[PDB]
């Protein structure tokens, strides 16, 4: 396995300044660790994780996104600088708009194939409390769910997501339980909670914390461009027809994207389904991949893919630009993984 080092002590938080919302941090720092440390400073990690073990270096590498993408974008959006260890042993200082910005944005896209992220400066989101104030809504059909996200009311909530019915036959199909909200201001909390503001179906202005608001299978996530709404509906309908019933289904409308060539999010309709591993599933997924790509969509790529190199290269129009950068920074493919070879990133 060649070079294998484990550095659990590379998790130092160097500085937290609430006046700049800036945090100077080791790449080994977990986002969970970061928020516990940044909370008393009135700072909030700009894109929430999905694991208490995911690191800053990993969050930049995967360019993670959450329920607030339409307002905050992706995690790469908030990186002000980082130190990259490259194949030649050099430690590069990368900024999103200075020279080396090409390497910067190739780093945000890539999963460490551009080198090892060692340290980073991240701009935090200022907050008065650790609570959300939210509105709950329910729709009766897929068409209603679409219309609900098309009134331009997304500008009134920094966070937004929906759970839709993917099992029911139309017109029930696509009916959703929608949850939208924002960070609570101090004056919006009940007095019971104002003492320690930064402590770790249908409704209006409900105050809830992080674990109340944000809360054998095949994870499948895709995004279809906003204008292709009829094509998006078609995919949802055909999924329901296929017989592959998913219980947990997340719906979301992405905002604009990064300058990162391999950044997943594009503006449009984001759907996360958990397919029970039935017979003929892999055939349907293949038949689901071509449909998504056909309309100009994109798939999410984890280790659980099950995604060909042709599909991957087709998803990302700037992939050749990225590959050129990877080669210039790692010609012998020292950081190259098995995943990189299969997707043909060398």
XYZ file of C-alpha atoms in Angstrom:
346
model
C 0.000 0.000 0.000
C 3.026 2.266 -0.361
C 2.985 5.400 1.774
C 0.426 5.197 4.592
C 0.598 7.666 7.490
C -2.052 8.396 10.105
C -1.958 11.831 11.752
C -4.826 12.159 14.253
C -3.008 15.116 15.829
C -3.110 17.186 12.633
C -6.380 18.647 13.915
C -5.263 21.996 15.296
C -7.534 25.015 15.056
C -4.996 27.814 14.725
C -7.233 30.881 14.985
C -10.863 31.979 15.113
C -11.699 35.641 14.530
C -15.351 36.731 14.654
C -14.552 40.155 13.176
C -13.390 38.576 9.913
C -15.438 35.368 10.259
C -12.129 33.713 9.366
C -10.821 30.413 10.695
C -7.262 29.205 10.139
C -7.478 25.447 10.421
C -5.609 22.170 9.905
C -7.083 20.002 7.162
C -7.511 17.159 9.645
C -9.955 19.204 11.701
C -13.439 17.699 11.514
C -16.371 19.993 10.743
C -18.009 18.753 13.946
C -14.928 19.820 15.906
C -14.941 23.149 14.066
C -18.545 24.104 14.863
C -18.181 23.357 18.581
C -15.176 25.688 18.631
C -16.626 28.371 16.361
C -20.083 28.577 17.974
C -19.090 30.664 21.030
C -17.543 33.173 18.613
C -20.893 33.626 16.891
C -19.669 31.757 13.834
C -21.401 29.014 11.868
C -19.772 26.566 9.454
C -21.030 27.698 6.002
C -21.935 24.216 4.736
C -23.000 21.581 7.252
C -21.577 18.041 6.922
C -23.261 14.642 7.028
C -20.712 12.909 9.234
C -19.089 13.887 12.535
C -15.818 12.531 11.143
C -15.597 14.395 7.822
C -12.567 16.681 7.723
C -12.009 20.185 6.354
C -9.639 18.713 3.780
C -12.325 16.227 2.801
C -15.076 18.839 2.667
C -12.975 20.872 0.246
C -12.027 17.760 -1.712
C -15.603 16.594 -2.192
C -16.827 20.193 -2.373
C -19.772 19.211 -0.178
C -23.200 20.843 -0.254
C -26.240 20.970 2.019
C -29.784 22.281 2.423
C -28.517 25.836 1.931
C -26.854 25.505 -1.476
C -29.290 27.867 -3.199
C -28.099 30.697 -0.947
C -24.573 29.752 0.125
C -23.373 27.575 -2.741
C -20.891 24.791 -2.022
C -18.109 24.425 0.562
C -15.503 25.599 -1.947
C -17.295 28.950 -2.119
C -16.105 29.750 1.388
C -12.447 28.744 1.191
C -10.369 31.923 1.207
C -7.019 30.120 0.938
C -5.362 26.744 1.457
C -1.950 25.080 1.494
C -1.530 22.247 -1.005
C 1.230 19.642 -0.800
C 2.106 18.685 -4.375
C 4.007 15.758 -5.917
C 7.272 17.720 -6.091
C 7.214 18.131 -2.304
C 6.402 21.825 -2.642
C 3.664 23.391 -0.510
C 1.553 25.642 -2.744
C -0.410 28.639 -1.443
C -3.720 28.689 -3.303
C -6.280 31.494 -3.571
C -9.594 31.503 -5.489
C -8.842 34.683 -7.472
C -5.078 35.237 -7.447
C -2.478 33.406 -9.504
C -2.703 29.622 -8.952
C -6.500 30.004 -8.924
C -6.702 27.345 -11.633
C -4.994 24.901 -9.280
C -7.182 26.208 -6.447
C -10.402 25.347 -8.254
C -9.011 22.060 -9.539
C -8.344 21.215 -5.890
C -11.899 22.005 -4.795
C -13.186 19.727 -7.541
C -10.812 16.824 -6.978
C -10.621 14.252 -4.206
C -6.999 14.840 -3.283
C -5.781 13.846 -6.761
C -4.287 17.322 -7.060
C -2.249 16.815 -3.904
C -2.774 16.851 -0.148
C -4.634 19.729 1.484
C -2.752 20.524 4.697
C -4.228 23.765 6.035
C -7.015 26.143 5.009
C -8.569 29.519 5.797
C -12.359 29.386 5.729
C -14.873 32.225 5.945
C -17.567 31.368 8.481
C -21.194 32.480 8.549
C -21.929 35.006 11.320
C -24.776 34.004 13.642
C -26.412 35.278 16.829
C -27.836 31.896 17.843
C -27.443 28.172 17.238
C -31.121 27.778 16.358
C -33.279 27.752 13.237
C -36.646 29.425 12.730
C -38.678 27.458 10.201
C -41.890 27.079 8.206
C -43.523 23.754 7.393
C -45.616 23.031 4.309
C -47.270 20.104 2.538
C -48.041 19.671 -1.161
C -50.430 17.218 -2.803
C -48.609 16.359 -6.024
C -45.338 16.574 -7.949
C -46.677 19.553 -9.898
C -47.453 21.390 -6.657
C -43.982 20.639 -5.298
C -42.443 22.133 -8.443
C -44.731 25.176 -8.293
C -43.875 25.619 -4.615
C -40.195 26.076 -5.477
C -40.906 28.259 -8.510
C -42.505 31.305 -6.864
C -39.123 32.848 -6.071
C -39.807 32.448 -2.355
C -36.503 30.602 -1.942
C -34.978 34.036 -1.327
C -36.791 34.171 2.025
C -35.097 31.078 3.476
C -31.386 30.292 3.590
C -32.115 26.588 4.136
C -34.649 24.446 2.271
C -35.373 20.781 1.543
C -38.339 18.485 0.897
C -39.266 14.830 1.345
C -41.481 13.603 -1.487
C -43.611 10.519 -2.126
C -41.928 8.407 -4.802
C -43.992 5.260 -4.278
C -47.557 6.502 -4.785
C -49.247 6.438 -8.179
C -50.165 9.847 -9.673
C -51.645 12.275 -8.917
C -50.301 11.447 -5.444
C -46.769 10.969 -6.805
C -44.384 13.751 -5.817
C -46.403 15.096 -2.896
C -43.918 16.542 -0.429
C -43.303 17.551 3.173
C -41.360 20.789 2.800
C -39.137 22.308 5.492
C -37.593 25.767 5.058
C -35.895 28.127 7.513
C -32.972 30.333 8.534
C -30.594 30.947 11.437
C -32.572 32.565 14.249
C -31.736 36.089 15.369
C -31.370 36.554 19.134
C -34.644 38.471 19.474
C -36.473 35.580 17.793
C -35.726 33.123 20.596
C -37.913 32.606 23.666
C -36.334 34.162 26.777
C -35.566 30.696 28.167
C -33.030 30.191 25.380
C -31.623 33.730 25.230
C -29.465 32.992 28.279
C -27.354 30.583 26.233
C -28.071 31.447 22.555
C -25.016 29.616 21.211
C -25.456 26.253 22.943
C -24.785 22.888 21.313
C -47.090 19.029 8.857
C -47.913 22.706 8.404
C -46.400 25.329 10.722
C -44.941 28.845 10.872
C -41.991 30.408 12.706
C -41.082 27.262 14.659
C -37.851 27.598 16.651
C -35.772 24.416 16.542
C -32.141 23.420 17.094
C -29.626 21.660 14.852
C -30.923 18.131 15.484
C -34.563 19.187 15.007
C -34.348 21.245 11.811
C -31.437 19.626 9.935
C -32.188 16.186 11.456
C -28.661 -3.074 1.563
C -29.572 0.016 -0.449
C -28.259 2.023 -3.394
C -27.875 5.769 -2.892
C -28.756 7.604 -6.098
C -28.482 11.376 -6.452
C -28.855 13.495 -9.571
C -29.631 17.016 -10.742
C -31.616 18.163 -13.781
C -31.284 21.759 -15.107
C -34.034 24.157 -13.988
C -35.623 24.777 -17.395
C -35.944 21.047 -18.125
C -38.933 20.746 -15.781
C -41.084 18.531 -18.029
C -38.072 16.275 -18.541
C -37.491 16.185 -14.783
C -41.104 15.207 -14.072
C -40.751 12.473 -16.690
C -37.840 10.928 -14.792
C -39.775 10.918 -11.514
C -42.822 9.356 -13.187
C -40.752 6.647 -14.878
C -39.019 5.800 -11.594
C -42.410 5.211 -9.989
C -43.449 3.099 -12.987
C -40.275 0.998 -12.852
C -41.323 -0.525 -9.532
C -38.138 0.460 -7.710
C -39.798 2.075 -4.693
C -37.757 4.413 -2.496
C -39.117 5.544 0.877
C -36.617 8.267 1.757
C -36.557 10.837 -1.042
C -34.980 14.283 -0.772
C -35.945 17.137 -3.095
C -34.021 20.401 -3.450
C -33.410 23.298 -5.846
C -29.716 24.051 -6.395
C -28.416 27.567 -6.970
C -25.488 28.658 -9.189
C -22.260 26.641 -9.297
C -18.525 27.052 -8.682
C -15.530 27.748 -10.892
C -14.492 24.230 -9.891
C -14.407 21.937 -12.970
C -15.451 18.828 -11.019
C -17.933 20.484 -8.673
C -21.143 18.438 -8.686
C -23.915 21.019 -8.178
C -25.513 22.819 -11.113
C -28.641 24.980 -10.798
C -31.744 22.811 -11.075
C -33.680 19.956 -9.521
C -31.737 17.864 -7.009
C -33.108 14.462 -5.993
C -31.696 11.871 -3.582
C -33.306 8.436 -3.580
C -32.392 5.237 -1.741
C -33.126 2.288 -4.022
C -33.700 -1.091 -2.366
C -31.373 -3.572 -4.063
C -33.909 -5.576 -6.066
C -33.470 -7.725 -9.168
C -32.907 -5.700 -12.330
C -31.841 -2.615 -10.394
C -28.453 -2.219 -12.087
C -30.172 -2.319 -15.477
C -32.563 0.443 -14.422
C -29.760 2.576 -12.979
C -27.886 2.367 -16.282
C -31.177 3.253 -17.955
C -31.543 6.007 -15.357
C -28.048 7.393 -15.994
C -28.541 7.952 -19.736
C -31.848 9.764 -19.097
C -30.295 12.169 -16.600
C -27.370 12.908 -18.921
C -29.727 13.207 -21.899
C -31.408 16.310 -20.486
C -28.098 17.924 -19.556
C -28.222 16.599 -16.017
C -25.498 15.252 -13.753
C -25.024 12.348 -11.339
C -23.456 12.277 -7.885
C -20.327 10.133 -7.726
C -19.454 8.319 -4.504
C -17.466 5.116 -4.034
C -20.769 3.296 -4.564
C -20.572 3.989 -8.300
C -21.222 2.154 -10.624
C -20.509 4.978 -13.074
C -18.594 4.553 -16.327
C -15.775 6.829 -17.472
C -17.772 7.855 -20.549
C -20.668 9.029 -18.391
C -18.302 10.865 -16.051
C -16.498 12.646 -18.890
C -19.859 13.566 -20.416
C -21.172 14.993 -17.133
C -18.300 17.460 -16.804
C -17.652 19.620 -19.906
C -14.483 21.027 -18.291
C -12.982 17.644 -17.389
C -10.170 17.935 -19.957
C -9.153 21.282 -18.487
C -9.022 19.646 -15.054
C -7.030 16.624 -16.242
C -4.411 18.918 -17.783
C -4.037 20.624 -14.404
C -3.772 17.304 -12.560
C -1.022 16.191 -14.950
C 0.965 19.408 -14.540
C 0.801 19.021 -10.772
C 1.116 15.225 -10.534
C 2.654 13.785 -13.742
C 3.485 10.350 -12.287
C 0.101 10.021 -10.586
C 1.461 9.710 -7.057
C -1.888 10.742 -5.562
C -3.778 8.604 -8.084
C -6.265 6.081 -6.703
C -8.085 3.083 -8.178
C -11.087 5.370 -8.609
C -9.016 7.818 -10.656
C -7.889 5.089 -13.058
C -11.382 3.702 -13.645
C -12.898 7.119 -14.367
C -9.813 7.735 -16.526
C -8.564 10.879 -14.789
C -4.900 10.130 -15.482
